[PDB]
């Protein structure tokens, strides 16, 4: 996990390692009941002891609700009064054990205990190496969701009174003996009260802490960090609540006649930024309003304000990593796009509104077969389009979002595939005639679909609705699966796998696409950050030139894997952390042995034991039929699709090995070099090497404005 028995109150992480674990498990062997029952027994194996002690640390509070009491030389007892510090206490020796642990260390230990208790009670997969064989503590941008580099040019011990906004006096030395301890606790309390609910947990790393000095020195002497003290700078790391990551106003207490103590600390904590605003329903409360920006978050703005106010006037604040990430995401050519946040979906919802108007019109048209269903299935309808949909921007390849138009059941369909497609074309012709005769403001034309092989008469209806949007209606009936199964039956033994690929393309276009769309839209609403992560991942694949041969639904699945199963990491709370988690996973993926099994759900319908083992048996059958993977590389499966081939079919083994090699080169780059603007720029530069030839081409017209950026 990354903890240790070291001191954490000096702006460090740890406080809990071998010794604390032994004393704690000895106390839990002694007992630990609410009426001094025993929780762990002598005859238990190490699995039982570990499950018990982690169940205890997950369930019981030891910092804010209660405390534990035992005697070493008769029984242990939990009591229900929190002492605002980690409190396991021995009365036979009158000690508190975990005073090296700060509140943030105990909070992160609580969250890790909950996560590993969940992974212990997980019965479906094998969670063993998932728990014990993945040191996540290597990259701080993969361990914590927001990193902040702040520099503190302090000066000298007597220059403290000028270089600080706080005061380190006599009783301050008594309570917080070392300056590092005092400044660290000051930053924790200031940043915690400033953020409030926009963070789940906090951590303050003191970069530059040398715990070693020679015999000829009185203490650890240094000159780094603009002063003579044992740190280079401060790394402020935040585990962020993603739903309240971007609430615009920071609500405080209400307004009575008397200035309350809480509103007094609010006013003396915000100064000029505070105000008193009357809201839409009529409440009168204090709040400090900010402004959203695409390139940088309100967390950065507020921690800049807080540290430059209540710490010093000399500190420097930075996260250019996430600044450049938000810059690398595209920005649509729309009014107020700059101040627009990254979680805004207003363009998508405007598209959906226009679609619903068209949906009503075509639903109440009059046809020989009445319409049964109309299902939007587009990438914009699942928020995974790369460029956000701009009105009248008709050069983006995702301008025409696919809708399925399905009529009622009828026994009088033709039973010959070409004439069947021609009958669907006849229905679309009547629809187009009625539209151009009734609702002339809409415009329309007809195109072809050659994505399905050997079915060459698939005609789609392009409709341009006057809010600037395009939909290509394609018709799905109750006879397509029947005719494709009959064709693949009557085909001879040589051409059967060709029609297998044909039917599989048909399924992935028409049938499982609808299930895919509704599932991803629902779980995206539960996971906001999935849409910026998948947009950034699609941008990365496009600049590395793999998107032309890898389909967008596979891109979305391989993007959403860490959101669905973030074990043993956390749920991503930044575009940076999400994208780098995706890169680390796709680098560590050994697809020749390991299949991808997902359960696309909201957080705590899941794939139970029988379905899971059946999918794994499908996988091992595929690997017995193909051990090396010259025909299939990625075996991805979910509840809507237990097949395992349907989205990753027809993929060149050069392309798959190139993708895994690019991920490995990327993660080795981040291993050898620190994460910064030059590293991410090198990440986004295209390769253009390992290719036997390259052909550079230009268009006569630049297409940025027409694409809507």
């Amino acid at each position: 996990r990354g903890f240790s028995s070291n001191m954490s109150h000096s702006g460090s992480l740890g406080g809990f390692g071998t010794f604390e674990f032994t004393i704690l498990m000895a106390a839990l062997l002694n007992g630990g009941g609410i009426n001094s029952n025993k929780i762990l027994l002598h005859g238990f194996s190490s699995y039982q002891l570990f499950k018990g002690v982690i169940k205890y640390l997950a369930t019981m509070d030891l910092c804010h609700d209660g405390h534990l009491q035992f005697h070493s030389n008769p029984a242990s007892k939990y009591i229900d009064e929190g002492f605002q510090t980690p409190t396991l206490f021995d009365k036979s020796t009158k000690v508190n054990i975990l005073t090296k642990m700060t509140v943030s260390s105990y909070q992160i230990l609580k969250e890790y205990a909950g996560e590993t208790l969940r992974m212990l009670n997980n019965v479906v997969q094998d969670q063993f190496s998932n728990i014990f064989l993945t040191n996540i503590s290597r990259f701080d941008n993969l361990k914590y969701d927001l990193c902040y580099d702040v520099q503190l040019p302090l000066g000298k011990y007597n220059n403290l009174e000028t270089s600080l906004a706080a005061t380190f006096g006599s009783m301050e030395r008594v309570k917080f003996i070392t300056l590092e301890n005092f400044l660290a606790h000051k930053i924790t309390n200031v940043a915690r009260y400033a953020l409030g609910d926009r963070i789940k947990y906090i951590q303050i790393e003191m970069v530059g802490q040398k715990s070693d000095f020679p015999i000829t020195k009185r203490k650890v002497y240094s000159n780094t960090g603009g002063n003579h003290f044992n740190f280079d700078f401060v790394r402020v790391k935040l585990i962020v609540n993603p739903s309240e990551c971007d609430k615009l106003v920071t609500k405080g207490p209400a307004h009575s006649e008397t200035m309350s103590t809480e509103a007094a600390v609010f006013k003396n904590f915000w100064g000029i930024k505070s105000s008193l605003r009357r809201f839409k329903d009529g409440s009168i409360t204090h709040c400090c309003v900010w402004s959203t920006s695409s390139s940088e978050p309100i967390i950065s703005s507020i921690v800049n304000f807080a540290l430059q106010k209540h710490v010093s006037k000399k500190a420097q604040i930075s996260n250019e990593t996430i600044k450049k990430f938000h810059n690398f995401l595209p920005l649509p050519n729309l009014p107020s796009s700059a101040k627009t946040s990254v979680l805004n979906l207003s363009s998508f919802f405007n598209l959906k509104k226009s679609f619903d108007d068209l949906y009503k019109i075509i639903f109440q048209m009059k046809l020989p077969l009445s319409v049964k269903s109309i299902l939007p299935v587009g990438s914009a309808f699942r928020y995974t389009s790369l460029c956000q949909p701009v009105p009248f921007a008709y050069s983006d390849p995702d301008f025409f979002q696919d809708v399925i138009l399905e009529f009622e059941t009828s026994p009088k369909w033709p039973d010959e595939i070409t004439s069947l497609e021609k009958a669907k074309t006849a229905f679309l012709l009547k629809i187009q005639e009625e539209l151009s005769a009734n609702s002339s403001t809409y415009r329309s034309f007809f195109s072809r679909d050659e994505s399905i092989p050997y079915n060459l008469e698939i005609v789609t209806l392009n409709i341009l609705t006057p809010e600037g949007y395009g939909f290509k209606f394609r018709v799905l009936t109750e006879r397509d699966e029947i005719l494709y199964l009959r064709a693949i039956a009557n085909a001879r033994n040589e051409l059967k796998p060709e029609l297998e690929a044909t039917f599989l393309k048909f399924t992935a276009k028409y049938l499982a696409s609808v299930r895919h769309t509704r599932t991803l839209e629902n779980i995206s609403h539960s996971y906001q950050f999935y849409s910026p992560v998948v947009r950034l991942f699609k941008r990365w694949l496009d600049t590395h030139l793999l998107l032309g041969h890898i389909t967008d639904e596979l891109a979305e699945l391989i993007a959403i894997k860490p959101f669905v199963d973030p074990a043993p990491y956390f749920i991503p709370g930044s575009l940076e952390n999400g994208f780098l988690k995706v890169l680390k996973f796709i680098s560590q993926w050994n697809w020749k042995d390991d299949p991808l099994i997902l359960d696309l759900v909201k957080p705590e319908e899941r794939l139970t034991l029988a379905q899971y083992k059946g999918i794994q048996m499908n996988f091992t059958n595929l690997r017995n039929s193909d051990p090396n993977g010259t025909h299939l590389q990625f075996f991805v499966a979910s509840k809507n699709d237990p097949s395992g081939i349907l989205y990753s079919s027809g993929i060149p083994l050069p392309i798959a090995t190139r993708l895994t090699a690019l991920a490995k080169v990327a993660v080795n780059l981040l291993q050898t070099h620190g994460l910064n603007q030059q590293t991410i720029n090198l990440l986004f530069t295209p390769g253009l090497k390992d290719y036997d030839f390259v052909v550079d081409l230009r268009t006569p017209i630049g297409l940025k404005s027409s694409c809507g950026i």
Partner: peptide
């Protein structure tokens, strides 16, 4: 089942992490 798989896996990790009497006697 959980008992069997976790027991075999902790046996693997303990034989991986186990130290040596030569180091013990030297120290």
């Amino acid at each position: 089942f959980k008992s069997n798989i976790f027991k075999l896996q902790i046996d693997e990790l303990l034989e991986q992490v186990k130290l040596k009497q030569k180091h013990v006697l030297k120290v």
